[PDB]
RNA sequence: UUAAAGAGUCAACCCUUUGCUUAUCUUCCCUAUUUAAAU
Protein backbone atom coordinates (compact mmCIF):
# COMPACT_ATOMS: atom_id res chain seq x y z
CA UNK A 1 0.00 0.00 0.00
CA UNK A 2 3.25 2.06 0.14
CA UNK A 3 2.39 3.97 3.42
CA UNK A 4 4.28 6.99 4.72
CA UNK A 5 6.91 6.65 6.93
CA UNK A 6 6.28 7.61 10.91
CA UNK A 7 8.73 10.26 10.30
CA UNK A 8 8.62 12.51 7.71
CA UNK A 9 9.09 16.65 7.23
CA UNK A 10 10.14 19.01 4.91
CA UNK A 11 11.83 22.08 4.51
CA UNK A 12 10.91 25.53 4.07
CA UNK A 13 11.61 26.73 0.73
CA UNK A 14 10.39 30.85 0.90
CA UNK A 15 12.39 32.28 3.64
CA UNK A 16 11.34 36.18 4.64
CA UNK A 17 13.54 38.51 6.98
CA UNK A 18 11.94 40.46 9.30
CA UNK A 19 10.14 43.86 7.65
CA UNK A 20 11.56 46.97 9.33
CA UNK A 21 9.75 50.08 9.11
CA UNK A 22 10.70 53.82 8.36
CA UNK A 23 9.65 57.58 8.17
CA UNK A 24 9.81 59.62 4.54
CA UNK A 25 8.23 61.89 2.51
CA UNK A 26 6.68 61.23 -0.49
CA UNK A 27 9.38 63.79 -2.47
CA UNK A 28 12.58 62.87 -0.02
CA UNK A 29 12.69 59.19 -0.02
CA UNK A 30 15.85 58.88 0.27
CA UNK A 31 16.20 59.84 3.88
CA UNK A 32 14.69 57.81 5.77
CA UNK A 33 14.00 57.53 10.23
CA UNK A 34 13.47 55.10 12.73
CA UNK A 35 10.33 54.20 14.48
CA UNK A 36 10.17 54.02 18.00
CA UNK A 37 7.82 52.35 19.94
CA UNK A 38 6.97 53.75 23.58
CA UNK A 39 4.43 52.81 26.11
CA UNK A 40 0.92 54.94 27.18
CA UNK A 41 -1.51 54.79 29.62
CA UNK A 42 -5.01 54.93 29.15
CA UNK A 43 -8.73 54.70 30.85
CA UNK A 44 -11.71 53.18 30.50
CA UNK A 45 -15.26 52.35 31.13
CA UNK A 46 -16.05 48.11 31.84
CA UNK A 47 -18.42 46.81 28.92
CA UNK A 48 -18.42 43.09 29.93
CA UNK A 49 -21.00 40.50 28.77
CA UNK A 50 -22.87 39.35 31.66
CA UNK A 51 -21.66 41.65 34.41
CA UNK A 52 -23.83 44.49 34.15
CA UNK A 53 -23.62 45.54 38.06
CA UNK A 54 -19.97 46.54 37.17
CA UNK A 55 -21.34 49.42 34.29
CA UNK A 56 -19.88 52.40 36.71
CA UNK A 57 -16.55 51.10 37.66
CA UNK A 58 -13.44 52.05 36.31
CA UNK A 59 -10.31 50.47 33.71
CA UNK A 60 -6.53 51.42 33.73
CA UNK A 61 -4.61 49.93 31.00
CA UNK A 62 -1.15 50.38 30.36
CA UNK A 63 -0.18 49.69 26.08
CA UNK A 64 1.94 50.43 23.44
CA UNK A 65 1.97 52.37 20.17
CA UNK A 66 3.54 53.23 17.09
CA UNK A 67 3.17 56.24 15.06
CA UNK A 68 4.81 58.51 12.24
CA UNK A 69 6.54 61.81 13.09
CA UNK A 70 4.21 64.71 13.01
CA UNK A 71 6.75 66.37 10.02
CA UNK A 72 6.65 62.86 7.74
CA UNK A 73 3.77 61.43 6.18
CA UNK A 74 5.03 58.15 4.11
CA UNK A 75 5.45 54.91 5.29
CA UNK A 76 8.31 52.70 4.01
CA UNK A 77 8.40 49.04 4.75
CA UNK A 78 11.34 47.45 3.28
CA UNK A 79 12.66 43.00 3.33
CA UNK A 80 14.13 40.54 1.65
CA UNK A 81 12.66 37.45 0.66
CA UNK A 82 14.71 34.29 -0.56
CA UNK A 83 13.28 31.82 -3.01
CA UNK A 84 15.63 28.30 -3.14
CA UNK A 85 14.74 25.27 -4.91
CA UNK A 86 15.45 21.08 -4.28
CA UNK A 87 11.92 20.64 -3.81
CA UNK A 88 10.69 17.22 -3.08
CA UNK A 89 13.55 16.13 -0.93
CA UNK A 90 12.94 15.32 2.43
CA UNK A 91 14.72 15.93 5.28
CA UNK A 92 13.73 12.56 7.27
CA UNK A 93 12.83 9.57 6.12
CA UNK A 94 11.79 9.17 2.42
CA UNK A 95 13.60 5.96 0.33
CA UNK A 96 10.32 5.07 -1.93
CA UNK A 97 7.32 7.19 -0.88
CA UNK A 98 9.26 10.73 -1.35
CA UNK A 99 10.55 9.31 -4.87
CA UNK A 100 7.05 8.09 -6.03
CA UNK A 101 5.14 11.46 -4.72
CA UNK A 102 8.14 13.04 -6.80
CA UNK A 103 7.64 10.84 -9.93
CA UNK A 104 3.95 11.21 -9.63
CA UNK A 105 4.16 15.50 -9.34
CA UNK A 106 6.44 17.49 -10.89
CA UNK A 107 4.13 17.10 -14.19
CA UNK A 108 2.39 20.58 -13.17
CA UNK A 109 2.75 23.39 -14.38
CA UNK A 110 5.11 26.10 -11.64
CA UNK A 111 4.03 28.52 -13.50
CA UNK A 112 0.63 29.75 -12.02
CA UNK A 113 2.16 28.96 -8.34
CA UNK A 114 5.78 31.04 -9.13
CA UNK A 115 3.11 34.62 -11.07
CA UNK A 116 0.61 34.44 -7.70
CA UNK A 117 3.78 34.00 -4.99
CA UNK A 118 4.89 37.77 -6.46
CA UNK A 119 1.32 39.22 -7.07
CA UNK A 120 0.91 38.76 -3.38
CA UNK A 121 3.95 40.64 -2.88
CA UNK A 122 3.70 43.00 -6.01
CA UNK A 123 -0.03 43.66 -5.36
CA UNK A 124 0.76 44.52 -1.74
CA UNK A 125 -0.42 42.04 0.49
CA UNK A 126 2.56 40.86 2.55
CA UNK A 127 1.74 44.58 4.33
CA UNK A 128 -1.40 43.89 6.59
CA UNK A 129 -3.75 46.60 7.84
CA UNK A 130 -1.50 49.13 7.43
CA UNK A 131 -2.85 49.47 4.19
CA UNK A 132 -6.03 51.45 5.38
CA UNK A 133 -6.20 54.92 4.98
CA UNK A 134 -3.86 55.00 2.18
CA UNK A 135 -4.52 56.54 -1.21
CA UNK A 136 -0.80 55.45 -3.16
CA UNK A 137 0.63 52.62 -2.51
CA UNK A 138 3.98 51.88 -4.24
CA UNK A 139 5.81 48.75 -4.49
CA UNK A 140 10.00 48.39 -5.88
CA UNK A 141 11.24 44.82 -6.19
CA UNK A 142 15.13 44.75 -6.70
CA UNK A 143 16.39 41.38 -8.36
CA UNK A 144 19.87 40.77 -10.68
CA UNK A 145 20.42 44.83 -10.93
CA UNK A 146 16.88 45.37 -12.04
CA UNK A 147 14.32 47.57 -10.26
CA UNK A 148 10.69 46.99 -11.02
CA UNK A 149 8.16 49.51 -9.37
CA UNK A 150 4.55 48.94 -8.86
CA UNK A 151 1.11 50.85 -8.45
CA UNK A 152 -1.43 47.63 -9.13
CA UNK A 153 -4.93 47.47 -7.33
CA UNK A 154 -7.55 44.74 -6.62
CA UNK A 155 -5.44 42.82 -4.19
CA UNK A 156 -7.76 40.02 -4.84
CA UNK A 157 -8.57 38.16 -8.04
CA UNK A 158 -5.38 37.90 -9.73
CA UNK A 159 -5.63 39.47 -12.98
CA UNK A 160 -2.89 39.38 -15.83
CA UNK A 161 0.08 41.79 -15.69
CA UNK A 162 4.13 42.47 -17.76
CA UNK A 163 5.96 43.12 -15.32
CA UNK A 164 4.81 40.27 -12.71
CA UNK A 165 5.08 37.55 -15.30
CA UNK A 166 8.79 38.15 -15.87
CA UNK A 167 9.52 37.66 -12.59
CA UNK A 168 7.09 34.96 -12.48
CA UNK A 169 9.09 32.69 -15.05
CA UNK A 170 11.78 33.49 -13.23
CA UNK A 171 10.85 32.68 -9.93
CA UNK A 172 8.88 29.28 -11.48
CA UNK A 173 12.54 28.14 -12.83
CA UNK A 174 14.47 28.22 -9.69
CA UNK A 175 11.25 26.30 -7.90
CA UNK A 176 11.72 23.17 -10.16
CA UNK A 177 15.35 23.20 -9.23
CA UNK A 178 17.78 25.52 -8.96
CA UNK A 179 20.00 27.44 -6.59
CA UNK A 180 18.57 30.34 -5.25
CA UNK A 181 17.46 33.14 -5.94
CA UNK A 182 16.87 36.59 -3.60
CA UNK A 183 14.17 39.66 -3.88
CA UNK A 184 14.30 43.01 -2.17
CA UNK A 185 11.30 44.53 -1.42
CA UNK A 186 9.94 47.84 -0.15
CA UNK A 187 6.35 49.39 0.21
CA UNK A 188 5.48 53.36 0.05
CA UNK A 189 2.77 54.27 1.63
CA UNK A 190 0.84 57.55 1.77
CA UNK A 191 -0.92 57.44 5.62
CA UNK A 192 -0.07 61.18 6.14
CA UNK A 193 1.49 63.25 8.96
CA UNK A 194 0.50 61.39 12.77
CA UNK A 195 -1.40 58.69 11.01
CA UNK A 196 -0.59 55.35 12.98
CA UNK A 197 1.41 52.45 12.21
CA UNK A 198 0.16 48.61 13.30
CA UNK A 199 3.00 46.34 14.12
CA UNK A 200 2.95 42.68 14.87
CA UNK A 201 1.87 41.38 18.19
CA UNK A 202 3.30 39.05 20.28
CA UNK A 203 2.35 36.54 23.31
CA UNK A 204 2.92 37.58 26.84
CA UNK A 205 2.09 36.24 30.05
CA UNK A 206 0.78 38.45 33.04
CA UNK A 207 3.08 41.80 33.08
CA UNK A 208 2.74 44.83 33.27
CA UNK A 209 1.77 45.50 29.99
CA UNK A 210 -1.69 44.53 28.54
CA UNK A 211 -0.28 45.38 24.76
CA UNK A 212 3.07 45.48 24.15
CA UNK A 213 4.64 45.16 20.18
CA UNK A 214 7.72 43.23 18.73
CA UNK A 215 10.79 45.61 18.04
CA UNK A 216 14.38 45.24 17.35
CA UNK A 217 16.83 47.57 19.29
CA UNK A 218 13.38 49.78 20.30
CA UNK A 219 12.24 50.18 16.54
CA UNK A 220 9.19 48.83 15.38
CA UNK A 221 9.18 45.50 12.82
CA UNK A 222 7.14 42.82 12.05
CA UNK A 223 7.54 38.94 12.25
CA UNK A 224 8.82 37.27 9.76
CA UNK A 225 6.04 34.30 9.63
CA UNK A 226 3.26 36.88 9.37
CA UNK A 227 5.24 38.36 6.51
CA UNK A 228 5.47 34.69 4.86
CA UNK A 229 1.91 33.59 6.12
CA UNK A 230 0.48 36.63 3.31
CA UNK A 231 2.76 35.16 0.74
CA UNK A 232 1.34 31.83 0.33
CA UNK A 233 -2.63 32.96 0.61
CA UNK A 234 -3.41 31.10 -3.06
CA UNK A 235 -6.03 28.47 -2.01
CA UNK A 236 -8.45 29.46 -4.16
CA UNK A 237 -8.94 25.88 -5.49
CA UNK A 238 -11.87 24.92 -3.44
CA UNK A 239 -15.70 24.34 -3.61
CA UNK A 240 -16.68 27.90 -2.53
CA UNK A 241 -15.51 30.63 -0.29
CA UNK A 242 -14.00 33.66 -3.00
CA UNK A 243 -11.39 35.39 -1.12
CA UNK A 244 -8.80 32.82 -0.57
CA UNK A 245 -7.08 31.85 2.56
CA UNK A 246 -3.37 30.32 3.25
CA UNK A 247 -1.94 27.34 1.31
CA UNK A 248 -2.63 24.54 4.85
CA UNK A 249 -3.56 21.13 5.69
CA UNK A 250 -6.38 20.96 6.56
CA UNK A 251 -6.85 24.64 5.25
CA UNK A 252 -8.29 26.41 7.54
CA UNK A 253 -8.27 30.17 9.61
CA UNK A 254 -8.48 30.13 13.01
CA UNK A 255 -9.54 34.28 13.38
CA UNK A 256 -13.06 33.05 11.25
CA UNK A 257 -13.30 29.85 13.08
CA UNK A 258 -13.95 27.57 10.37
CA UNK A 259 -12.06 25.18 8.66
CA UNK A 260 -12.80 24.23 5.18
CA UNK A 261 -11.20 21.30 3.28
CA UNK A 262 -12.46 19.39 6.76
CA UNK A 263 -12.79 15.40 6.37
CA UNK A 264 -14.69 15.11 2.87
CA UNK A 265 -12.17 13.42 0.62
CA UNK A 266 -10.50 16.75 0.62
CA UNK A 267 -7.52 16.76 2.56
CA UNK A 268 -3.15 16.74 1.77
CA UNK A 269 -2.82 13.60 3.03
CA UNK A 270 -5.62 11.96 1.29
CA UNK A 271 -4.66 13.23 -1.88
CA UNK A 272 -1.03 12.67 -1.15
CA UNK A 273 -1.87 9.28 -0.03
CA UNK A 274 -3.77 8.73 -3.54
CA UNK A 275 -1.01 10.33 -5.81
CA UNK A 276 1.65 7.63 -4.58
CA UNK A 277 -1.35 4.75 -5.46
CA UNK A 278 -2.16 4.35 -8.69
CA UNK A 279 -4.48 7.15 -10.02
CA UNK A 280 -3.38 10.39 -10.13
CA UNK A 281 -5.17 14.12 -9.87
CA UNK A 282 -6.25 17.30 -11.95
CA UNK A 283 -4.78 20.22 -12.02
CA UNK A 284 -5.83 22.41 -9.52
CA UNK A 285 -5.28 19.27 -6.78
CA UNK A 286 -1.61 19.32 -8.09
CA UNK A 287 -1.21 23.03 -7.85
CA UNK A 288 -2.59 22.69 -3.66
CA UNK A 289 0.00 19.25 -2.90
CA UNK A 290 2.80 21.38 -4.93
CA UNK A 291 2.07 24.52 -2.72
CA UNK A 292 1.87 22.86 0.20
CA UNK A 293 4.92 21.34 0.04
CA UNK A 294 6.94 24.25 -0.60
CA UNK A 295 5.22 25.23 2.67
CA UNK A 296 7.24 22.87 5.62
CA UNK A 297 5.47 20.53 8.34
CA UNK A 298 5.43 17.34 9.72
CA UNK A 299 3.75 14.38 7.94
CA UNK A 300 2.93 11.18 9.59
CA UNK A 301 1.39 9.47 12.51
CA UNK B 1 -30.90 29.85 19.11
CA UNK B 2 -27.79 31.44 17.07
CA UNK B 3 -25.86 32.87 20.15
CA UNK B 4 -22.92 34.48 20.00
CA UNK B 5 -19.94 33.04 19.11
CA UNK B 6 -16.82 32.68 21.94
CA UNK B 7 -14.79 35.58 19.91
CA UNK B 8 -16.12 38.07 18.23
CA UNK B 9 -14.90 41.29 17.78
CA UNK B 10 -14.70 45.24 15.79
CA UNK B 11 -12.36 47.43 14.60
CA UNK B 12 -12.39 51.38 15.17
CA UNK B 13 -13.62 52.69 12.00
CA UNK B 14 -12.93 56.45 12.87
CA UNK B 15 -9.17 57.33 13.45
CA UNK B 16 -8.08 60.50 15.16
CA UNK B 17 -4.84 62.23 15.29
CA UNK B 18 -2.77 63.79 18.57
CA UNK B 19 -4.01 67.38 18.12
CA UNK B 20 -1.27 69.80 18.38
CA UNK B 21 -1.38 73.39 19.86
CA UNK B 22 0.24 76.71 18.55
CA UNK B 23 -0.12 80.84 19.43
CA UNK B 24 -0.69 82.54 16.64
CA UNK B 25 -2.15 86.28 16.40
CA UNK B 26 -5.94 87.00 15.77
CA UNK B 27 -5.13 88.56 12.11
CA UNK B 28 -1.31 86.99 11.88
CA UNK B 29 -2.34 83.42 11.84
CA UNK B 30 0.14 82.06 9.26
CA UNK B 31 3.04 82.30 10.89
CA UNK B 32 3.25 79.22 14.19
CA UNK B 33 5.15 79.45 17.62
CA UNK B 34 4.87 76.25 19.97
CA UNK B 35 3.96 76.31 23.52
CA UNK B 36 5.77 74.84 26.36
CA UNK B 37 5.53 73.47 29.58
CA UNK B 38 8.50 73.37 32.08
CA UNK B 39 7.50 72.78 35.72
CA UNK B 40 6.32 75.19 38.63
CA UNK B 41 6.27 74.61 42.49
CA UNK B 42 3.09 75.95 44.50
CA UNK B 43 2.24 76.36 47.96
CA UNK B 44 -0.88 76.42 49.96
CA UNK B 45 -2.98 74.66 53.12
CA UNK B 46 -4.08 71.32 53.53
CA UNK B 47 -7.79 71.03 53.60
CA UNK B 48 -9.14 67.38 54.23
CA UNK B 49 -12.55 66.63 55.25
CA UNK B 50 -12.85 64.58 58.73
CA UNK B 51 -9.28 65.91 59.66
CA UNK B 52 -9.19 69.17 61.60
CA UNK B 53 -6.23 69.22 63.85
CA UNK B 54 -3.61 69.71 60.95
CA UNK B 55 -5.32 71.94 58.59
CA UNK B 56 -2.91 74.51 60.43
CA UNK B 57 0.15 73.05 58.33
CA UNK B 58 1.77 73.91 55.09
CA UNK B 59 1.35 71.89 51.84
CA UNK B 60 4.01 71.86 49.02
CA UNK B 61 3.66 70.57 45.28
CA UNK B 62 5.19 70.41 42.10
CA UNK B 63 2.70 70.54 39.12
CA UNK B 64 2.99 71.47 35.28
CA UNK B 65 1.85 74.27 33.71
CA UNK B 66 1.55 76.07 30.15
CA UNK B 67 0.05 79.36 29.40
CA UNK B 68 0.59 80.95 25.87
CA UNK B 69 2.89 83.53 25.63
CA UNK B 70 2.39 87.61 26.13
CA UNK B 71 3.25 88.39 22.50
CA UNK B 72 0.19 86.01 21.54
CA UNK B 73 -3.80 86.40 21.60
CA UNK B 74 -4.90 83.23 19.78
CA UNK B 75 -4.62 79.73 20.07
CA UNK B 76 -4.38 77.35 17.15
CA UNK B 77 -5.19 73.49 17.33
CA UNK B 78 -5.42 71.26 14.70
CA UNK B 79 -5.80 67.30 14.16
CA UNK B 80 -6.83 65.30 11.27
CA UNK B 81 -9.99 62.98 11.29
CA UNK B 82 -10.34 59.67 8.82
CA UNK B 83 -13.39 57.90 8.21
CA UNK B 84 -13.29 54.30 6.71
CA UNK B 85 -15.95 51.94 5.67
CA UNK B 86 -15.94 48.03 5.58
CA UNK B 87 -18.85 48.46 8.52
CA UNK B 88 -20.62 44.81 9.41
CA UNK B 89 -16.90 43.12 8.89
CA UNK B 90 -15.80 41.20 11.83
CA UNK B 91 -12.35 40.59 11.96
CA UNK B 92 -12.76 38.06 15.05
CA UNK B 93 -15.32 35.25 14.44
CA UNK B 94 -18.22 35.12 12.71
CA UNK B 95 -19.74 33.57 9.66
CA UNK B 96 -23.71 33.04 10.20
CA UNK B 97 -24.12 35.47 13.19
CA UNK B 98 -22.33 38.48 12.05
CA UNK B 99 -23.62 37.96 8.23
CA UNK B 100 -27.11 37.37 10.05
CA UNK B 101 -26.94 40.81 11.45
CA UNK B 102 -25.40 42.16 8.34
CA UNK B 103 -28.29 41.20 6.46
CA UNK B 104 -30.95 42.19 9.65
CA UNK B 105 -29.30 45.58 9.40
CA UNK B 106 -28.96 48.36 6.70
CA UNK B 107 -32.83 48.90 6.63
CA UNK B 108 -32.17 52.80 8.11
CA UNK B 109 -30.91 55.79 6.64
CA UNK B 110 -26.95 56.25 8.01
CA UNK B 111 -28.01 59.91 7.21
CA UNK B 112 -28.33 60.94 10.96
CA UNK B 113 -25.62 59.48 12.09
CA UNK B 114 -23.21 61.26 9.13
CA UNK B 115 -24.83 64.40 10.10
CA UNK B 116 -24.27 63.67 13.93
CA UNK B 117 -20.21 63.08 13.68
CA UNK B 118 -19.86 66.02 11.48
CA UNK B 119 -22.15 68.44 13.53
CA UNK B 120 -19.76 67.41 16.41
CA UNK B 121 -16.86 68.23 15.18
CA UNK B 122 -17.94 71.19 13.63
CA UNK B 123 -19.28 73.01 16.30
CA UNK B 124 -16.54 72.71 18.52
CA UNK B 125 -17.57 70.35 21.06
CA UNK B 126 -14.55 68.06 20.65
CA UNK B 127 -12.66 71.19 21.94
CA UNK B 128 -12.61 70.01 26.22
CA UNK B 129 -12.96 72.65 29.03
CA UNK B 130 -10.69 74.98 27.66
CA UNK B 131 -13.53 76.33 25.17
CA UNK B 132 -14.16 79.09 28.26
CA UNK B 133 -12.55 82.18 28.47
CA UNK B 134 -13.25 82.76 24.53
CA UNK B 135 -15.33 85.21 22.81
CA UNK B 136 -14.85 83.68 19.11
CA UNK B 137 -14.44 80.51 18.31
CA UNK B 138 -13.46 79.58 14.68
CA UNK B 139 -13.07 75.81 12.39
CA UNK B 140 -11.51 75.64 9.26
CA UNK B 141 -12.25 72.07 7.67
CA UNK B 142 -10.86 71.26 4.73
CA UNK B 143 -11.80 67.71 2.92
CA UNK B 144 -10.83 66.83 -1.26
CA UNK B 145 -9.16 70.56 -1.78
CA UNK B 146 -12.43 72.43 -0.12
CA UNK B 147 -12.42 74.64 3.09
CA UNK B 148 -15.42 75.11 4.81
CA UNK B 149 -14.91 77.75 7.80
CA UNK B 150 -17.46 77.61 11.11
CA UNK B 151 -18.41 79.77 13.59
CA UNK B 152 -21.95 78.09 14.55
CA UNK B 153 -22.66 78.40 18.40
CA UNK B 154 -25.62 76.14 20.08
CA UNK B 155 -23.20 72.94 20.38
CA UNK B 156 -26.38 70.83 21.98
CA UNK B 157 -29.95 70.74 20.31
CA UNK B 158 -28.95 69.53 17.59
CA UNK B 159 -30.30 71.57 14.87
CA UNK B 160 -30.05 72.20 10.51
CA UNK B 161 -27.74 73.72 8.76
CA UNK B 162 -27.03 73.59 4.91
CA UNK B 163 -22.84 73.72 5.05
CA UNK B 164 -23.02 70.92 7.36
CA UNK B 165 -24.93 68.58 4.49
CA UNK B 166 -22.61 69.05 2.18
CA UNK B 167 -20.10 66.84 4.48
CA UNK B 168 -22.82 64.78 5.87
CA UNK B 169 -23.71 63.29 2.71
CA UNK B 170 -19.95 62.12 1.83
CA UNK B 171 -19.95 60.99 5.09
CA UNK B 172 -23.01 58.70 5.04
CA UNK B 173 -21.58 57.57 1.56
CA UNK B 174 -18.61 56.51 3.15
CA UNK B 175 -20.07 54.84 5.98
CA UNK B 176 -22.16 52.29 4.04
CA UNK B 177 -18.94 50.74 2.40
CA UNK B 178 -16.10 52.20 0.54
CA UNK B 179 -12.70 53.28 1.37
CA UNK B 180 -11.14 56.01 3.37
CA UNK B 181 -11.92 60.08 3.91
CA UNK B 182 -9.56 62.20 5.40
CA UNK B 183 -10.13 65.84 6.98
CA UNK B 184 -8.08 68.19 8.45
CA UNK B 185 -10.11 69.90 11.29
CA UNK B 186 -8.43 73.64 12.60
CA UNK B 187 -9.43 75.92 15.80
CA UNK B 188 -9.00 79.30 16.77
CA UNK B 189 -9.46 80.39 19.90
CA UNK B 190 -9.91 84.10 21.97
CA UNK B 191 -9.01 83.50 25.35
CA UNK B 192 -6.82 86.55 25.37
CA UNK B 193 -3.10 87.56 26.62
CA UNK B 194 -1.32 85.24 28.97
CA UNK B 195 -4.37 82.58 29.23
CA UNK B 196 -4.03 79.01 30.89
CA UNK B 197 -4.44 76.66 28.72
CA UNK B 198 -5.71 73.19 29.19
CA UNK B 199 -3.87 70.10 27.47
CA UNK B 200 -4.68 66.32 28.31
CA UNK B 201 -3.42 64.61 31.63
CA UNK B 202 -1.70 61.17 32.26
CA UNK B 203 -2.33 58.36 35.06
CA UNK B 204 0.99 58.02 37.06
CA UNK B 205 1.99 56.57 39.64
CA UNK B 206 3.54 57.85 43.66
CA UNK B 207 6.51 60.16 41.86
CA UNK B 208 8.15 63.36 42.51
CA UNK B 209 5.61 64.93 40.47
CA UNK B 210 1.61 65.04 42.06
CA UNK B 211 0.20 66.38 38.11
CA UNK B 212 2.29 66.08 34.72
CA UNK B 213 0.76 66.53 31.49
CA UNK B 214 1.11 64.94 28.67
CA UNK B 215 3.50 66.45 25.55
CA UNK B 216 5.39 65.64 22.21
CA UNK B 217 9.22 66.35 22.29
CA UNK B 218 8.04 69.33 24.84
CA UNK B 219 4.75 70.55 22.75
CA UNK B 220 1.74 70.16 24.75
CA UNK B 221 -1.26 68.03 22.89
CA UNK B 222 -4.02 66.00 23.43
CA UNK B 223 -4.44 61.87 23.47
CA UNK B 224 -6.55 60.73 20.41
CA UNK B 225 -8.88 59.07 22.82
CA UNK B 226 -10.17 62.29 24.14
CA UNK B 227 -10.54 63.87 20.33
CA UNK B 228 -12.56 60.93 19.51
CA UNK B 229 -14.68 60.45 22.71
CA UNK B 230 -16.23 63.49 22.35
CA UNK B 231 -17.74 63.26 18.36
CA UNK B 232 -19.85 60.05 19.30
CA UNK B 233 -21.51 62.01 21.99
CA UNK B 234 -25.01 61.47 20.09
CA UNK B 235 -26.99 59.38 22.15
CA UNK B 236 -30.02 61.31 22.53
CA UNK B 237 -32.08 57.78 22.28
CA UNK B 238 -33.43 56.93 25.44
CA UNK B 239 -36.22 57.89 28.05
CA UNK B 240 -34.48 61.62 29.29
CA UNK B 241 -31.38 62.90 30.45
CA UNK B 242 -31.01 65.52 27.10
CA UNK B 243 -27.19 66.52 26.87
CA UNK B 244 -26.35 63.47 25.82
CA UNK B 245 -23.64 60.83 26.53
CA UNK B 246 -21.25 58.60 24.43
CA UNK B 247 -22.44 55.52 23.05
CA UNK B 248 -20.84 52.65 25.08
CA UNK B 249 -22.45 49.21 25.56
CA UNK B 250 -24.07 49.44 28.86
CA UNK B 251 -23.53 53.29 28.44
CA UNK B 252 -22.07 54.95 32.03
CA UNK B 253 -20.66 57.77 32.77
CA UNK B 254 -17.98 56.84 35.43
CA UNK B 255 -17.59 60.91 36.37
CA UNK B 256 -21.15 61.03 37.27
CA UNK B 257 -20.84 57.49 38.98
CA UNK B 258 -24.47 56.39 36.92
CA UNK B 259 -24.84 54.16 34.64
CA UNK B 260 -27.91 54.57 32.12
CA UNK B 261 -28.96 52.43 29.62
CA UNK B 262 -28.73 49.10 32.96
CA UNK B 263 -30.60 46.40 32.79
CA UNK B 264 -33.76 46.91 32.24
CA UNK B 265 -34.27 45.28 29.16
CA UNK B 266 -32.48 48.14 27.02
CA UNK B 267 -28.78 46.43 26.71
CA UNK B 268 -26.21 46.25 23.45
CA UNK B 269 -25.98 42.75 23.77
CA UNK B 270 -29.50 41.70 24.14
CA UNK B 271 -30.47 44.37 21.12
CA UNK B 272 -27.50 42.24 18.78
CA UNK B 273 -29.69 38.76 20.41
CA UNK B 274 -32.94 40.19 19.58
CA UNK B 275 -32.25 41.74 15.99
CA UNK B 276 -30.65 38.30 14.08
CA UNK B 277 -33.24 36.17 16.22
CA UNK B 278 -36.80 37.00 14.37
CA UNK B 279 -38.22 40.21 15.42
CA UNK B 280 -36.44 43.16 14.37
CA UNK B 281 -35.78 46.71 16.37
CA UNK B 282 -37.20 50.33 15.86
CA UNK B 283 -35.12 53.01 13.79
CA UNK B 284 -33.80 54.40 17.22
CA UNK B 285 -32.59 51.15 18.25
CA UNK B 286 -30.68 50.66 15.10
CA UNK B 287 -28.97 54.04 14.95
CA UNK B 288 -27.83 52.57 18.58
CA UNK B 289 -26.61 49.45 17.59
CA UNK B 290 -24.57 50.94 14.57
CA UNK B 291 -23.49 53.83 16.31
CA UNK B 292 -21.82 51.29 18.56
CA UNK B 293 -20.41 48.75 16.06
CA UNK B 294 -18.84 51.37 14.25
CA UNK B 295 -16.67 51.88 17.59
CA UNK B 296 -14.57 49.13 18.35
CA UNK B 297 -14.63 46.56 21.17
CA UNK B 298 -14.94 43.09 21.90
CA UNK B 299 -18.43 41.42 22.55
CA UNK B 300 -18.39 37.78 23.87
CA UNK B 301 -18.38 35.25 25.83
C1' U C 1 -8.23 -10.63 91.47
C1' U C 2 -2.74 -16.93 88.61
C1' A C 3 -4.55 -11.84 94.55
C1' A C 4 -0.06 -10.90 98.33
C1' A C 5 6.44 -10.39 97.73
C1' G C 6 11.89 -9.55 95.14
C1' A C 7 19.11 -4.83 93.04
C1' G C 8 21.99 -8.14 87.44
C1' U C 9 26.33 -6.35 88.13
C1' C C 10 31.83 -5.73 86.51
C1' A C 11 36.08 -5.51 81.95
C1' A C 12 37.80 -4.48 76.28
C1' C C 13 42.53 -1.33 69.60
C1' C C 14 39.36 -3.96 64.10
C1' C C 15 43.22 -3.38 61.55
C1' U C 16 46.39 -3.70 56.21
C1' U C 17 46.32 -3.36 50.12
C1' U C 18 43.77 -1.03 44.99
C1' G C 19 43.53 2.36 37.24
C1' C C 20 36.88 2.07 35.53
C1' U C 21 36.83 2.77 30.17
C1' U C 22 36.28 3.01 24.94
C1' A C 23 32.29 5.23 20.65
C1' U C 24 28.11 9.06 19.03
C1' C C 25 23.89 14.34 13.94
C1' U C 26 18.17 16.02 17.32
C1' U C 27 15.91 17.26 13.53
C1' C C 28 11.81 19.49 10.53
C1' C C 29 6.38 24.12 11.07
C1' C C 30 3.60 28.45 12.82
C1' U C 31 -1.04 35.64 12.04
C1' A C 32 -1.71 37.03 18.99
C1' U C 33 -5.56 40.52 17.72
C1' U C 34 -10.10 43.57 19.54
C1' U C 35 -11.56 48.81 22.07
C1' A C 36 -11.39 52.90 26.08
C1' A C 37 -11.53 60.75 27.99
C1' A C 38 -6.74 61.87 34.32
C1' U C 39 -9.83 61.81 39.49
Same mark, same amino acid.
Given at each position: ??????????????????????????????????V???????A?????????????????????????????????????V?????????????????N??????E??????????????????????????????????????????????????????????????????????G?????????? =?????????????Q???????????????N???????????????????? =???????????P =?????????????G??????????????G???????????????????????
Amino acid at each position: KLKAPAVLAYSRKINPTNALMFAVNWSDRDNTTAVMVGTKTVAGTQSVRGNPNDADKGNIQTVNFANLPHNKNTLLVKYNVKFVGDVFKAELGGGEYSNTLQTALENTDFGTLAYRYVYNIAAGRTLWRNRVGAESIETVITVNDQTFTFSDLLVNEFDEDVDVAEIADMVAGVLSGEGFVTLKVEH =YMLLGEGSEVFPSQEFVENSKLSKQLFDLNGQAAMHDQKIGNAIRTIDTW =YEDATTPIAVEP =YGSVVRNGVAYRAGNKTDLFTLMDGAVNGKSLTEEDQMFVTANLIRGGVFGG
